[PDB]
Amino acid sequence: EVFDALIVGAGFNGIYQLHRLRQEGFKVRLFEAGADMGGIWYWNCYPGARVDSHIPIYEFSIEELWRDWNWTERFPAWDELRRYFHYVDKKLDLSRDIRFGMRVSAAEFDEARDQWVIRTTDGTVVRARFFILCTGFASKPYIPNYKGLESFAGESFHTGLWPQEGASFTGKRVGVVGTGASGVQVVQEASKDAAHLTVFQRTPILALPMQQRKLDVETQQRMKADYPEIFRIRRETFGGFDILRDERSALEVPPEERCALYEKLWQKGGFHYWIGGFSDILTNEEANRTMYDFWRDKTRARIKNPALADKLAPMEPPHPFGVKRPSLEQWYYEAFNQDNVSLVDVREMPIVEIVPEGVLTSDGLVELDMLVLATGFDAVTGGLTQIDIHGTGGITLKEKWTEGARTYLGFATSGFPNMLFLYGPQSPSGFCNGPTCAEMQGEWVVDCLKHMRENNKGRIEATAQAEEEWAQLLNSIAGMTLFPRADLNFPGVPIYMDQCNTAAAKDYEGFVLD
Numbered sequence: 427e428v429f430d431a432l433i434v435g436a437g438f439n440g441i442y443q444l445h446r447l448r449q450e451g452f453k454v455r456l457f458e459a460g461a462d463m464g465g466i467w468y469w470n471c472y473p474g475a476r477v478d479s480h481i482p483i484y485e486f487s488i489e490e491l492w493r494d495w496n497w498t499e500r501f502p503a504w505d506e507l508r509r510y511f512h513y514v515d516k517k518l519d520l521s522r523d524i525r526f527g528m529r530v531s532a533a534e535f536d537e538a539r540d541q542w543v544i545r546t547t548d549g550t551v552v553r554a555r556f557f558i559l560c561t562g563f564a565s566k567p568y569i570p571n572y573k574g575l576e577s578f579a580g581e582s583f584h585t586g587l588w589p590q591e592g593a594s595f596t597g598k599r600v601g602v603v604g605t606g607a608s609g610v611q612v613v614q615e616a617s618k619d620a621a622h623l624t625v626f627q628r629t630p631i632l633a634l635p636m637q638q639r640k641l642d643v644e645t646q647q648r649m650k651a652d653y654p655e656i657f658r659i660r661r662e663t664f665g666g667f668d669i670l671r672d673e674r675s676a677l678e679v680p681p682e683e684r685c686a687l688y689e690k691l692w693q694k695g696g697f698h699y700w701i702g703g704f705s706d707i708l709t710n711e712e713a714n715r716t717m718y719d720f721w722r723d724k725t726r727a728r729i730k731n732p733a734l735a736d737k738l739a740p741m742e743p744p745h746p747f748g749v750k751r752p753s754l755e756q757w758y759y760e761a762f763n764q765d766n767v768s769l770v771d772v773r774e775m776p777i778v779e780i781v782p783e784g785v786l787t788s789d790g791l792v793e794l795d796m797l798v799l800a801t802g803f804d805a806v807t808g809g810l811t812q813i814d815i816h817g818t819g820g821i822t823l824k825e826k827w828t829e830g831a832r833t834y835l836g837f838a839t840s841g842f843p844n845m846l847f848l849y850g851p852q853s854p855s856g857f858c859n860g861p862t863c864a865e866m867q868g869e870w871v872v873d874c875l876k877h878m879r880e881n882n883k884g885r886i887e888a889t890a891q892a893e894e895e896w897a898q899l900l901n902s903i904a905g906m907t908l909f910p911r912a913d914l915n916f917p918g919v920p921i922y923m924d925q926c927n928t929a930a931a932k933d934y935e936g937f938v939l940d
C-alpha cells in the first residue's frame with residue numbers, strides 16, 4: 427500500500443490538501459478519525475457551536491464553491507457548516523479518497539525507501555512517501571485533574587466530546603467550567619433552558635459583540651460580485667480576514683476620533699473590534715488600554731450588578747486586550763442578570779473536589795444535574811504528539827517537543843523527514859482564519875512536493891540550525907508586541923508567508939533535499 431502522500435485530517439486543511447494534490451497528479455489518500463468530514467464541526471455539535479469568522483470569509487475561495495452556496499446567517503452554526511462540507515464533497519468528489527474511522531496512531535520512517543510506515547488503531551498500515559498532518563487546533567481536549575471528577579453522578583462531557591445524539595439543559599441544574607469560546611456559546615444556550623446555571627470562571631473572557639445577522643439568498647447574490655476581491659484582500663491581512671486595520675496611532679489621534687472608530691468597529695462586530703483598530707493597539711500598552719476601556723464600559727452597562735460587573739468586566743484588565751484570540755458573544759452578558767444564573771470566580775472560591783452531587787468550591791457545594799467541561803484544548807502540540815511518531819533522530823515527536831515546539835517555517839521538524847504539518851506550532855494558526863491559512867499554507871505544501879517531483883528529490887528534512895534560527899525570528903517578532911503577555915502562534919500571516927515563500931525560492935533553504 428504505497429502512496430505519494432497520506433493526509434490525516436478532513437477539516438479545511440486536509441480537504442484542501444486532498445483536492446489540490448489529486449489535481450497535481452499525486453496518488454493520495456486521506457485518513458479521518460471521525461465518521462464524516464468537517465473537522466471541528468464533526469466533533470463540536472454542542473448547543474450554540476458557531477464560527478467566529480464571518481461569511482464570505484470562513485469558506486473556500488474556489489469559485490465553483492461559493493458561486494452556488496448561500497449561508498443562512500453571518501455566523502453559521504456547526505450543523506450548517508456540516509452541510510457546507512457535504513456540498514464541498516459532492517462538488518470536488520473527495521470522499522472516494524477518504525477513509526473514515528481511521529485514527530492514525532503510530533508512524534515510522536523507512537530511510538532505505540524514503541517513505542513513512544503509518545499505523546492506525548484498527549491495525550491498517552500504509553506506506554506514504556510524504557506524511558501530511560492536518561490535525562488542527564482542537565484534537566486533544568483538556569480535562570483538568572480535579573479530585574473525584576469521574577465520581578460525578580450526572581451527565582458530564584467536554585464541549586469537544588458532546589454526544590452525537592444531543593442532550594438538553596431544560597429544567598436541569600447545569601454547571602459549566604471554563605469560559606472559553608465554547609463556554610460562552612454553551613452558557614448562552616443553557617441560560618434560557620436550565621433550572622439553574624452556575625459558571626466557573628478562572629479569568630474573565632473579553633468577549634466581543636458578534637453582531638449576528640440573518641441572511642437571504644437575494645442580498646448574497648448581489649454581494650458575490652465583490653467576492654473575488656474579498657478573497658484577494660483576505661490573503662494580505664494580519665490574520666487572514668477581510669479586516670483592514672486603521673494605520674494611524676491611537677495615541678496620535680484625538681480622543682473623540684478614537685471613540686468614533688471604536689464605535690464603528692463595535693457596530694460591524696466580530697473581529698472588526700479585535701483586529702480593525704489602530705496600528706499600535708497590539709504593540710503599545712497605552713493604546714491597548716483605550717480599546718479595553720471602551721469595551722469595559724460597553725460591557726459593564728449590560729450588567730446590572732456592580733459586584734458581577736467587577737467579575738465580568740474588571741476596571742483593570744487582567745491581560746492586554748486582544749492578545750489571545752477573542753471570543754464572540756450575542757447575549758452572554760445579559761444571561762448573568764437572570765435569577766437562575768450564578769457566577770463563581772475560581773480565583774476567589776477555588777474548586778476543592780468533584781463529588782457525585784456536584785462541584786465543591788471553597789465556599790460550598792454546587793449541586794448539578796449535568797457538568798459541562800468547557801475547559802478548552804491542549805496546544806497544537808498535544809494533537810500532533812498524540813500520534814506516536816518515530817523520527818530518524820531516534821526519538822518520538824512527543825519526546826522532541828517535551829521542552830517545547832521545535833520547527834522550521836512552522837511546517838517541519840529536524841529528525842522528521844518527508845513530514846509536513848498544516849496549522850502547526852509556530853505558524854499563524856490560532857491567529858489565522860482557517861480556510862485562509864489552509865489555502866495559503868496549502869499552496870506552499872503543494873509547491874514543495876511539485877518541486878521535489880520536478881527535481882527527483884525523494885527526501886526533505888529541516889535542519890537543526892534552521893529550526894534554531896526560526897525560533898529566534900518568532901521571539902524577535904513577538905518581542906515587538908504585547909502577545910507574550912498572554913496566559914506559540916506566529917503573529918502575522920503576510921510576514922509569515924513571505925519568509926516561507928522566500929525559503930522556497932532559494933530552493934528550500936533550511937531543508938536537506940535528497
Ligand SMILES: Cc1cc2nc3c(=O)[nH]c(=O)nc-3n(C[C@H](O)[C@H](O)[C@H](O)COP(=O)(O)OP(=O)(O)OC[C@H]3O[C@@H](n4cnc5c(N)ncnc54)[C@H](O)[C@@H]3O)c2cc1C
Nearest residue numbers: 435437438439459465466477478479530561562563859860
Ligand atoms: C468550536 C470551534 C470553533 C472554531 N471556529 C473557528 C473559526 O470560526 N475560524 C477559525 O479560523 N478557526 C476556528 N476554530 C479553530 C479551528 O481548529 C481552526 O480554525 C481550523 O478550522 C482547523 O482546521 P483544520 O483543517 O486545520 O483541522 P480541524 O478542523 O481542526 O480538524 C482536524 C481533523 O483531524 C482529525 N484527526 C485528528 N487526529 C487524528 C488522527 N490521529 N488520525 C486521524 N485523524 C485525525 C480530527 O478528527 C479532525 O477532524 C474553531 C475551533 C473550535 C473548537
Ligand SMILES: [Mg+2]
Nearest residue numbers: 537538539540
Ligand atoms: Mg534514504
